[PDB]
Design an enzyme around this catalytic site. Structure first.
Site, PDB file in Angstrom:
ATOM      1  N   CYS A   9       2.961   0.766  -4.385  1.00  0.00           N
ATOM      2  CA  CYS A   9       2.876  -0.837  -3.827  1.00  0.00           C
ATOM      3  C   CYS A   9       2.596  -1.708  -4.663  1.00  0.00           C
ATOM      4  O   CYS A   9       2.779  -1.406  -6.053  1.00  0.00           O
ATOM      5  CB  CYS A   9       1.620  -0.518  -2.522  1.00  0.00           C
ATOM      6  SG  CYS A   9      -0.066  -0.162  -3.196  1.00  0.00           S
ATOM      7  N   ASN A  12      -1.593  -0.861  -5.878  1.00  0.00           N
ATOM      8  CA  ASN A  12      -1.894   0.391  -5.828  1.00  0.00           C
ATOM      9  C   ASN A  12      -3.274   0.414  -5.598  1.00  0.00           C
ATOM     10  O   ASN A  12      -4.233   1.425  -6.163  1.00  0.00           O
ATOM     11  CB  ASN A  12      -1.653   1.062  -7.308  1.00  0.00           C
ATOM     12  CG  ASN A  12      -1.848   2.621  -7.345  1.00  0.00           C
ATOM     13  OD1 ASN A  12      -2.368   2.986  -8.588  1.00  0.00           O
ATOM     14  ND2 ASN A  12      -1.559   3.361  -6.365  1.00  0.00           N
ATOM     15  N   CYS A  14      -4.175  -0.542  -1.555  1.00  0.00           N
ATOM     16  CA  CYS A  14      -4.591  -0.274  -0.283  1.00  0.00           C
ATOM     17  C   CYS A  14      -3.275   0.541   0.331  1.00  0.00           C
ATOM     18  O   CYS A  14      -3.950   1.227   1.012  1.00  0.00           O
ATOM     19  CB  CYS A  14      -4.172  -1.622   0.335  1.00  0.00           C
ATOM     20  SG  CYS A  14      -5.402  -3.074  -0.149  1.00  0.00           S
ATOM     21  N   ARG A  15      -2.001   0.645  -0.002  1.00  0.00           N
ATOM     22  CA  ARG A  15      -1.256   1.510   0.462  1.00  0.00           C
ATOM     23  C   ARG A  15      -0.823   2.558  -0.356  1.00  0.00           C
ATOM     24  O   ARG A  15      -0.920   3.723   0.534  1.00  0.00           O
ATOM     25  CB  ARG A  15      -0.082   0.515   0.694  1.00  0.00           C
ATOM     26  CG  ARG A  15      -0.338  -0.420   1.812  1.00  0.00           C
ATOM     27  CD  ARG A  15       0.764  -1.548   1.926  1.00  0.00           C
ATOM     28  NE  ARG A  15       0.997  -2.429   0.741  1.00  0.00           N
ATOM     29  CZ  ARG A  15       1.872  -3.199   0.434  1.00  0.00           C
ATOM     30  NH1 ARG A  15       3.111  -3.310   1.102  1.00  0.00           N
ATOM     31  NH2 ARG A  15       1.795  -4.010  -0.576  1.00  0.00           N
ATOM     32  N   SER A  16      -0.379   2.554  -1.446  1.00  0.00           N
ATOM     33  CA  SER A  16       0.191   3.863  -2.039  1.00  0.00           C
ATOM     34  C   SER A  16      -1.080   4.803  -2.426  1.00  0.00           C
ATOM     35  O   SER A  16      -0.650   6.038  -2.332  1.00  0.00           O
ATOM     36  CB  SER A  16       0.871   3.328  -3.334  1.00  0.00           C
ATOM     37  OG  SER A  16       0.184   2.584  -4.355  1.00  0.00           O
ATOM     38  N   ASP A 126       1.229  -5.018   3.751  1.00  0.00           N
ATOM     39  CA  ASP A 126       0.042  -5.020   3.136  1.00  0.00           C
ATOM     40  C   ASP A 126      -1.033  -5.404   3.946  1.00  0.00           C
ATOM     41  O   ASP A 126      -1.213  -6.381   4.579  1.00  0.00           O
ATOM     42  CB  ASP A 126       0.279  -5.932   2.121  1.00  0.00           C
ATOM     43  CG  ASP A 126      -0.870  -6.236   1.261  1.00  0.00           C
ATOM     44  OD1 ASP A 126      -1.786  -5.695   1.322  1.00  0.00           O
ATOM     45  OD2 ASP A 126      -0.557  -7.267   0.262  1.00  0.00           O
TER      46      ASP A 126
END
Length: 154
Positions: A9, A12, A14-16, A126
């Protein structure tokens, strides 16, 4: 040989890191963690050093998914060593494609993680400026996409 996947993301945080933690628990539950190298990284340097967003940790704790990470930026090496680089949104994809054309060896296939979603929610958006419900959506997307990816890589 070992198979490898790097989730990516922008920051690195929130998402990945959620994608990485969901996939690692999926392979560990199926007795094949030893066959996989699993990681996450950022396209940018904005959060380097930082652990996952604590809203993400709260979400993972609800679901019983272990999650530990320190944010890092993708490196030129990662394009040579990973089998798959699975990112969250189209802006990540454009960035990753740009970086991948600057190295000699790109083994990695670079794709949207949401390209695996049987529900066809292609973009993992995001959640940083959202709420807990947005982190929960990210989680659910990662669970669907990771299972599909594990069942049949593109």
């Amino acid at each position: 040989v070992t198979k490898s996947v790097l989730f990516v993301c922008l920051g690195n945080i929130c998402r990945s890191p959620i994608a990485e933690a969901v996939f690692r628990k999926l392979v560990t539950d199926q007795n094949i963690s030893e066959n996989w190298r699993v990681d996450s990284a950022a396209t940018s340097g904005y959060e380097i050093g930082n652990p996952p967003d604590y809203r993400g940790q709260s979400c993972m704790k609800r679901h019983g998914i272990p999650m530990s990470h320190v944010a890092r930026q993708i490196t030129k090496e990662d394009f040579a060593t990973f089998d798959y680089i699975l990112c969250m949104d189209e802006s990540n994809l454009r960035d990753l494609n740009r970086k991948s054309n600057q190295v000699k060896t790109c083994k990695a296939k670079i794709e949207l993680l949401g390209s695996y979603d049987p529900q066809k929610q292609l973009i993992i958006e995001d959640p940083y400026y959202g709420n807990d419900s947005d982190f929960e959506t990210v989680y659910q997307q990662c669970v669907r996409c990771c299972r599909a990816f594990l069942e049949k890589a593109h």
